[PDB]
Structure 1
């Protein structure tokens, strides 16, 4: 999951499983998820569990 513009409008939404979390399909992402600025904008990350 990343971020991107859609429908040739000013809508920038989130494809992928991260986007799923954003919309209310589940409330925890337990999987090999990474960490970076964009994602850390609006999602809370646990302390890192594997380096």
Structure 2
């Protein structure tokens, strides 16, 4: 996504995208709207 946006065709990303360093200094973000973490899923 951000690679293709930096390519130039895309102009503004709207997706369930997380927040992390390298992409943060490489492109800034807006204020968060949905909050989550990391979790395991398994069958019973």
Taking structure 2 as the reference length, the TM-score comes to: 0.69
Which runs of at least 4 in structure 1 moved beyond 4 Å after TM superposition? none
Q: Which runs of 5+ in 1 are unaligned?
A: 1-16
How many residues get paired?
35
Q: Which runs of 5+ in 2 are unaligned?
A: 36-44
Q: Structure 2 CA distance, aligned partners of 1:28 and 1:49?
A: 16
Taking structure 1 as the reference length, the TM-score comes to: 0.61
Greater length-normalized contact order (CA 8 Å, ≥ 6 residues apart): 2
